[PDB]
């Protein structure tokens, strides 16, 4: 299935993907040149995309879209600024029909010691905890530094 | 005991040695081995800091490879298989706008 990971610009969203396939991570500029893999787990094989905050990235996101059904929608507990402007907009475009398609397995970031962001607290802020809709997911993770490994891959399985 | 890379913005004494181990012991603690990074399959040959970011460094051994390594991995971020020899050293490259060993 067409399942997309989303978040930052400059994030190294990518740092993340192949830190993910390949263990070892990637630039912390996420993509930027178009990016799809695909990955059985569970062996219904998900094409697994990487999309930068390229500013132009996050436009185009909204451009094409359509084809999905899934997806890994990745924020940071520790940005609390574009986080905040963002949220609102990501929500609503997750609003955006086709989105409602798609369970929001949401990765928070950063999360690691003097400093982050409270898990209660953006949860609240976006109401956000909220199951007035859909099989959503909750995921705590620096997925920068990988955190939830297998958890991931497999509390999604659950349906 | 091969070789000692050092930080030098931040207090420190990265050593390398043939144990198959580096340490890192921290001058300011005195001494202290504060980490001990391993990750080998030998005799640790090499150590050079990747000064640029000191904070990020990289490995030579004649095992014939190169973990590169994030403090959060007190093994390498991956490791590399480079030589068909073995990898007696690595080097930075002076510049910091691009790199090379």
């Given amino acids: 299935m067409r399942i997309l990971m989303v978040g930052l610009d400059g994030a190294g ?22 990016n799809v893999e695909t990955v059985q787990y569970k062996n219904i094989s998900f094409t697994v995309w990487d999309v930068g905050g390229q500013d132009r ?10 084809n999905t059904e899934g997806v890994i929608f990745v924020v940071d507990s520790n940005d609390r600024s574009r986080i905040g402007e963002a949220r609102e907009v990501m929500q609503r475009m997750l ?12 990765f928070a970031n950063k999360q690691d010691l003097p400093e982050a962001m409270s ?14 809709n859909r099989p959503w997911f909750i995921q705590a993770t620096c997925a920068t530094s990988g955190e939830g490994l297998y958890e991931g891959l497999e509390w999604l399985s659950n349906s | 005991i091969r070789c000692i890379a050092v930080h030098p913005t931040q207090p420190f004494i990265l050593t390398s040695s043939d144990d198959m181990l580096i340490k890192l012991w921290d001058w300011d603690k005195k ?51 480079g030589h068909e020899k073995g990898v007696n050293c690595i080097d930075y490259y002076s510049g910091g706008d691009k790199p090379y060993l």
């Fill in chain 1, 57 to 66: 990235i996050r436009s185009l996101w909204r451009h094409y879209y359509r």
């Fill in chain 2, 31 to 81: 001494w202290s081995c504060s980490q001990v990074f391993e990750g080998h399959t030998h005799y640790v040959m090499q150590i050079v800091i990747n000064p640029k970011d000191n904070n990020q460094f990289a490995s030579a051994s004649l095992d014939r490879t190169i973990k590169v390594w994030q403090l959060g991995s007190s093994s390498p971020n991956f490791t590399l298989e």
């Fill in chain 1, 119 to 132: 898990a209660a607290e953006i949860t609240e802020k976006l109401g956000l905890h909220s199951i007035r």
């Fill in chain 1, 95 to 106: 609003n955006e029909d086709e989105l409602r398609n798609a369970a929001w397995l949401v």
């Fill in chain 1, 13 to 34: 969203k990518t740092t993340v993907l192949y830190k993910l396939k390949l263990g070892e991570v990637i630039t912390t500029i996420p993509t930027i040149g178009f």
